Amino acid sequence: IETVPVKLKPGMDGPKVKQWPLTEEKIKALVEICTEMEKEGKISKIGPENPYNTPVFAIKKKDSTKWRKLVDFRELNKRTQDFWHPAGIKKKKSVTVLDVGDAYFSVPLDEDFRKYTAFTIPSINNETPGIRYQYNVLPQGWKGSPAIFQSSMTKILEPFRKQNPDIVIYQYMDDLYVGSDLEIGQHRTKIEELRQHLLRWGPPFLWMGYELHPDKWTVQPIVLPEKDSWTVNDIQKLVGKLNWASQIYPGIKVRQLCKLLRGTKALTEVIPLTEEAELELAENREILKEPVHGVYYDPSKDLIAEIQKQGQGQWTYQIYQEPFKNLKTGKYARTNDVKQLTEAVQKITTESIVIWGKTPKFKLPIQKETWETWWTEYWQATWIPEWEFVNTPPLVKLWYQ
Amino acid sequence: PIETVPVKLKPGMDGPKVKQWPLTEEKIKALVEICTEMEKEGKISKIGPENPYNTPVFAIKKKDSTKWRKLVDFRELNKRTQDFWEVQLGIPHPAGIKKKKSVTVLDVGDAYFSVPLDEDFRKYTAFTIPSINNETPGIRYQYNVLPQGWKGSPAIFQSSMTKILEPFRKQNPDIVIYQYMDDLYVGSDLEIGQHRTKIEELRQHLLRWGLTTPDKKHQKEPPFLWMGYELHPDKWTVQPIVLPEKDSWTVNDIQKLVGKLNWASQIYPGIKVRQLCKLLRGTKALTEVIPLTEEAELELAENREILKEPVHGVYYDPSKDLIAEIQKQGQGQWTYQIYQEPFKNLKTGKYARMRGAHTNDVKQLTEAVQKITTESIVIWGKTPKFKLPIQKETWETWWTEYWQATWIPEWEFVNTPPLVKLWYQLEKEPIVGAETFYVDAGYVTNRGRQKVVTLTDTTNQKTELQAIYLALQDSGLEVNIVTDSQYALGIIQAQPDQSESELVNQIIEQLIKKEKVYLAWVPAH
Ligand SMILES: Cc1ccnc2c1NC(=O)c1cccnc1N2C1CC1
Numbered sequence: 001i002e003t004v005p006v007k008l009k010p011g012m013d014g015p016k017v018k019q020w021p022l023t024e025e026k027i028k029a030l031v032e033i034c035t036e037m038e039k040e041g042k043i044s045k046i047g048p049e050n051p052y053n054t055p056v057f058a059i060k061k062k063d064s065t066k067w068r069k070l071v072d073f074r075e076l077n078k079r080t081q082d083f084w085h086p087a088g089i090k091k092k093k094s095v096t097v098l099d100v101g102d103a104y105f106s107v108p109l110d111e112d113f114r115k116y117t118a119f120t121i122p123s124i125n126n127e128t129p130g131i132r133y134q135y136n137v138l139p140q141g142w143k144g145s146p147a148i149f150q151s152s153m154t155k156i157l158e159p160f161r162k163q164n165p166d167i168v169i170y171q172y173m174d175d176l177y178v179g180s181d182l183e184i185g186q187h188r189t190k191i192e193e194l195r196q197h198l199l200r201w202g203p204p205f206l207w208m209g210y211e212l213h214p215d216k217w218t219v220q221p222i223v224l225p226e227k228d229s230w231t232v233n234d235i236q237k238l239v240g241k242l243n244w245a246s247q248i249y250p251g252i253k254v255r256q257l258c259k260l261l262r263g264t265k266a267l268t269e270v271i272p273l274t275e276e277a278e279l280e281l282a283e284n285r286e287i288l289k290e291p292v293h294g295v296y297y298d299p300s301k302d303l304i305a306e307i308q309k310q311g312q313g314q315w316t317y318q319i320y321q322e323p324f325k326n327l328k329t330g331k332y333a334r335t336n337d338v339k340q341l342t343e344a345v346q347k348i349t350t351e352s353i354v355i356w357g358k359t360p361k362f363k364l365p366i367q368k369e370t371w372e373t374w375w376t377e378y379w380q381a382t383w384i385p386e387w388e389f390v391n392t393p394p395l396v397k398l399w400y401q
Numbered sequence: 402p403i404e405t406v407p408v409k410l411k412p413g414m415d416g417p418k419v420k421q422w423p424l425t426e427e428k429i430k431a432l433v434e435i436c437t438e439m440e441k442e443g444k445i446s447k448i449g450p451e452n453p454y455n456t457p458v459f460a461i462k463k464k465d466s467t468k469w470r471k472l473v474d475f476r477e478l479n480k481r482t483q484d485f486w487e488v489q490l491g492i493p494h495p496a497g498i499k500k501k502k503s504v505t506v507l508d509v510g511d512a513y514f515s516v517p518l519d520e521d522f523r524k525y526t527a528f529t530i531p532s533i534n535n536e537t538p539g540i541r542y543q544y545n546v547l548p549q550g551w552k553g554s555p556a557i558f559q560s561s562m563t564k565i566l567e568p569f570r571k572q573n574p575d576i577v578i579y580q581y582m583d584d585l586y587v588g589s590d591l592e593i594g595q596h597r598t599k600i601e602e603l604r605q606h607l608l609r610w611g612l613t614t615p616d617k618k619h620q621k622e623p624p625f626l627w628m629g630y631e632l633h634p635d636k637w638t639v640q641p642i643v644l645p646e647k648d649s650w651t652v653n654d655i656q657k658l659v660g661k662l663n664w665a666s667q668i669y670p671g672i673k674v675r676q677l678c679k680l681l682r683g684t685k686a687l688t689e690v691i692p693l694t695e696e697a698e699l700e701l702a703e704n705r706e707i708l709k710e711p712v713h714g715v716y717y718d719p720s721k722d723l724i725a726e727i728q729k730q731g732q733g734q735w736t737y738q739i740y741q742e743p744f745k746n747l748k749t750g751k752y753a754r755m756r757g758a759h760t761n762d763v764k765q766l767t768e769a770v771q772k773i774t775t776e777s778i779v780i781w782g783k784t785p786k787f788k789l790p791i792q793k794e795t796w797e798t799w800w801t802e803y804w805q806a807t808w809i810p811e812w813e814f815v816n817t818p819p820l821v822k823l824w825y826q827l828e829k830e831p832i833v834g835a836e837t838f839y840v841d842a843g844y845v846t847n848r849g850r851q852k853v854v855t856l857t858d859t860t861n862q863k864t865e866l867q868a869i870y871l872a873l874q875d876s877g878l879e880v881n882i883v884t885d886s887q888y889a890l891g892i893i894q895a896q897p898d899q900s901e902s903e904l905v906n907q908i909i910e911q912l913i914k915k916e917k918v919y920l921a922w923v924p925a926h
Contacts, residue, residue: 021775024782048556049407051484124782125497126489127579129563233831236883236923243924264839266847267831267881267921309806337806366806369771373778374808392804394894395887395922 003110004148008079014052014116015075019130020372022122026058029067030121033058034133037069042105043133050134052118057376062208070376072384073141076116083147085357089168092179094187095212095354096205098195099382101174103202104138104145107152117142140174141382156201160194172353174382175206184211206382207350214354220316220329222288222399224281233267235260237398242284244399248324249287256280295325297356303327305348305360305385307341308397315344316400319352319360328355331401341366342378349385362387402610403565405517406557409483416454416525417477426533428460431469433530436542444514444546452541454527473528475550481525485556492628493579496739496748497780500635500716501577501588503596506621507604509583510613513547513554516561526551555582569606573599586625588634629664636713639668644705653687655680662704668714670736670749671707676700715745717781723747725773725785729762729819732899735769739777739785748780759897759905762821763799766791770809787812791821799823803895824898825912828919835879835917840868850875865889866904873911873918881919890922 008014022030037043055072089095109117114134121131138145146153153171161169167190168179178194180187195203222245225234239254239261246252256277265271273281301321308316313334320326328351332344345362352360364371368389410416424432439445457474518526526544547554562580570578576599579586587603589596597617604614624631631638642665647654659674666672676697684691693701721741730736735752752769770787777784789812800807838844842864843853852875856867865886872882884890892905893912900906912918 021779022782023778023784027782047406048485048553048560049409049483051486053486125493125780126491127493127497129489129559129580132486231831233921236921240922240924264837264845264847267835267837267883267919268833269847309804311801336808337800338808341806364806365804367768367771369775370808373771373774393887394804394891397804 001108003108006110006113006144006148007081008116009081012079014118015054015079016051017053017055017072017075019053019055019120019122020057022057024124026376027122027124029058030056030069031131033067033069034121034131038133040105042137043135046115046118046132046134050115050118050132052116054117054119056119056121057379059376059379061204062206062380064204068382069140070379070382070384071119071139071141073139073143074384074386077141077143080142080144083144086168086170086179089170089177089179090214090217090355092168093181093213093215094184095177095179095214096187096191096210097207097212097350098176098178098191098203099174099206100171100176100198100203101140101382103153104140104149104174106202107138107149109135109138113144141384143173146171146173156198160197164190170354170357172357172383175353176203177354179214187211207380212350212354217330217351219291220331220401221290223401224285224288229270230273231268231270232261232265235271236267238281240395241399244395245288248292249284251287252284253280254284291326291329295320295327297321297327299356303352303356303358303360304363305352306363306390307344307348307365308392308400309337309365310397310401313340314401315340316397317344317348318400319348329400338366338370338374339378342375345385345387346379346381349381349383359383359385361385363390364388365390365392403516403561405519406553406560408519408522408553410481410525411483414481416527417456417481418454419457419477421455421457421529421531422459424459424531428469429531429533429539431460432458432471433540435469435471436530436540440542445542445544448524448527448541448543450541452524452527452543454525456526456528458528458530473548473550475548475552478525479552482552485553488555488559494748494780495627495630495632495637495716496714497717499719502590502634503593504586504588504623504625504632504634505596505600506625507585507587507600507607507614508621509585509607510615511611512583513549513558515611515613516547516558518544518547565607565610565612569603576603635716637716638711638713639665641711642708644701644708649690650680650693651687652681652684652689652691655691656687665708666749666751668712668746668749669707670738672704672751673700673730674704675731675734712746715740715742715747717741717747719781723777723781723783723785724788725777726788726815727752727766727769727773728790728817729766729821733765735766737769737773739773748776755901758902759892759895759900761799761823761896761898763791763796763823764803764895766821767807767809770812774810784810786810788815788817789813790815790817790819795822798826799896823896824909825896825915825918827894827896828917830919831921832879832881832917832919835881835919836876837881837883838872838876839883840865840872841885842867842871844868844872844875862888863904866892866902866908869893870904870908870911873908873915878916879918880915881921883921883923885923885925887922890920893920 034043038045054076057070058067059070061068114136117135117139118132123130138148166180170177178191180190182190227234235257239257242252242254256274257280260271260273260277298321303319303321305317305319310316315332317330317332318326319328332347334340349359352358362385364387366389436445440447456478459472461470461472462468463470523543523545526548528542530540532539547558559580566578576587576589587600589599591599607614624633626640629640631640642661655677659677662672662674676694677700680691680697718741723739723741725737725739727735727737733753733755737752738749739747741747752772754768756768774784787810792814837847842856843851845851852871854871856864859867866889869882869884869889872880897905898909900909
């Protein structure tokens with residue numbers, strides 16, 4: 001076929017990323033997979049004259065007993081040239097996510113780019129050199145792929161698009177987001193059909209095979225303890241919380257509360273509240289009832305995502321671009337920490353895609369070595385967000401949920 | 402006689418054009434004999450003045466032999482040559498290999514010189530042999546095979562190598578080969594003779610490609626002292642380590658000793674160097690002499706005793722499960738050993754890594770488990786079932802309440818003191834009827850009590866901890882403490898049980914003593 005010439009952003013060179021060591025189980029799965037990808041001429045074994053590399057992992061399909069080869073094209077995607085979103089989707093009632101990755105494989109990759117797609121199948125204890133290949137077709141997870149395949153895509157999709165304009169479809173990387181307002185019964189059917197209408201040309205369900213229901217996504221407002229009797233401690237926590245949130249909602253006043261706190265009283269000493277205090281709380285309580293006004297999504301900025309461990313299998317996240325200027329906040333509850341955490345990330349990323357058609361730069365409350373050790377064990381997405389590791393302040397965790 | 406690998410110079414770069422050093426007629430003679438020997442063997446060939454590139458050559462004799470040797474300085478060429486895939490820096494660890502019945506080392510003679518060089522690249526490998534007479538110029542050649550000392554040489558070679566074996570390999574699932582630089586380790590479970598025979602088969606397979614190797618009578622025999630270890634086909638150990646019996650030790654000596662001691666720890670359990678390491682504090686010269694302490698010499702002698710008795714690691718038995726067991730050897734020290742069969746060690750090791758200024762055994766213990774896991778996946782592509790001196794309840798407690806997310810694989814509690822526990826727990830709510838201390842280097846209580854102390858040479862962060870220390874000190878068995886320092890709050894809420902800040906440790910002591918303690922934070926002004 002006619003291969004479109006692709007190129008890296010000016011002056012940039014190809015990825016030379018270390019491959020995190022894998023477990024025998026994974027390795028074997030990858031050998032078996034890539035071996036068949038080779039026979040099909042999808043990929044080809046490469047030589048020493050190729051100094052590039054990208055990490056590879058094997059994830060397990062959701063309710064499927066097969067493996068999926070995952071490739072961390074992050075470094076590459078960042079260095080690839082820029083190739084040149086339905087707000088209605090986020091309102092849809094039902095959205096299903098499919099994996100269209102295999103389409104790409106029908107299209108060849110520009111010969112002079114192929115080398116950058118080099119990756120390696122590692123050997124246990126380095127007992128073996130490690131099997132190296134590069135791609136011949138468009139590789140899954142590479143931002144280039146969707147672009148270069150856009151045209152052929154639109155083509156096999158215009159029928160459905162007009163034969164069913166009541167359905168919204170968005171494509172992000174290897175994923176196809178099919179939205180609608182139909183009854184979950186109707187929806188599932190129309191989804192299946194689309195599947196054969198694609199079989200017609202070039203798709204197991206992604207994300208539990210299951211649905212998503214955007215319409216029901218809501219913001220987690222900052223809350224205040226409502227309680228019967230108030231002790232010095234309670235109030236202290238209160239004021240502390242309040243003061244913090246006053247940097248977001250400046251209308252919050254603590255004046256009266258702070259006054260119930262004059263004197264070095266005993267912590268457990270109950271404090272009946274005054275009239276002014278009562279109203280000050282109420283007013284504050286009222287201010288917090290909704291997200292702060294003004295905050296808007298800036299497409300030219302990085303979408304950041306922070307998570308906090310609450311406990312009891314409960315987590316808190318916030319999506320923003322500028323500190324305190326949250327675009328969304330939420331909650332996640334169940335396993336073990338990591339598993340939970342990954343599920344949080346993925347969940348969160350999906351939302352970001354669905355809403356702002358983009359993936360966020362997470363900040364994870366965990367240790368690299370550990371994360372690098374298990375994340376692949378529960379990961380099911382076809383994409384991989386950028387992430388960094390941090391040390392959550394005990395106060396922040398306190399100020400949420 | 403194999404596929405040549407395509408090479409290129411780094412972009413926007415021309416081949417090396419560097420002048421040949423003035424040689425000696427004596428050396429010019431040797432070189433011409435060598436380059437002629439070589440041109441008749443095809444590895445090099447005369448070129449026309451067409452070629453403007455040039456690389457410096459020179460003559461050095463063999464070591465302890467009175468025989469000339471050609472050397473080509475490729476620094477420049479290499480500065481210009483494209484990069485290659487990494488000549489694996491990844492080296493197999495003995496505990497990861499399985500026993501064989503027999504094993505064999507096959508040294509590859511004329512390795513590099515048995516492989517072709519990208520023809521379009523040969524020109525860049527130009528060099529010259531000066532003439533002895535003036536207007537009778539000297540010989541220009543270029544490389545046709547792989548020049549030792551060149552960038553790609555090791556890579557390309559190591560590559561081809563594997564390509565060649567791949568075949569033999571496939572029709573010999575039985576046999577195991579590992580290639581390292583110029584040696585080829587080959588073991589099998591074949592009965593003695595059958596083994597010896599298949600080696601030749603191999604030796605031939607290589608022959609078919611001009612790959613010269615040593616015959617049975619000239620090959621190296623087990624064990625194989627491999628970078629740090631002695632490898633018999635069924636057992637291993639470390640490179641024999643005897644401890645000097647000096648009476649005067651230099652800073653450097655001690656450094657070298659510690660290093661050695663370290664190495665040994667991976668297999669020799671109970672090796673300790675805490676005391677010897679102590680000996681370095683304040684040292685001012687690599688040649689300064691430090692006398693031994695009673696604990697240092699005791700330790701030395703104890704290690705010396707440990708080493709005296711040789712140990713031998715066992716090989717990996719993939720059919721079995723690998724068990725990893727961990728112990729707290731000292732404050733901050735942990736020892737572990739992994740095995741498939743009781744006491745039959747694959748590998749051992751210590752863990753002293755302190756991540757953070759303050760920690761607790763649980764956090765620390767956990768971090769060790771991680772270290773181990775990582776290693777395992779690497780040596781065996783699998784993780785071990787752990788044996789741990791801590792009970793779930795303990796773990797769970799700390800876990801659940803720590804702000805960072807964490808995870809430990811399948812683990813079994815082993816009742817092997819010392820057990821790791823939490824020496825104290827902050828109350829989760831204010832203590833009723835417990836005096837309330839308000840701190841900021843001083844405090845005030847609900848009961849009128851107070852003390853504004855004096856601290857000199859104290860840092861902001863350090864002043865805050867002080868007050869709290871004070872509070873703990875004068876209070877009774879139950880206290881509620883209110884502070885504005887998020888720092889201290891943090892430090893303590895993490896319930897450390899060891900810290901290298903003396904103050905902390907003190908406080909820590911206080912905490913352990915108390916019946917119930919509640920810490921609360923409130924803003925500044
Ligand atoms: C250095 C080295 C690295 C990797 N594997 C091995 C060796 N050397 C051996 O001596 C060895 C010993 C026992 C079993 N396999 C061994 N071999 C395998 C190749 C037969």
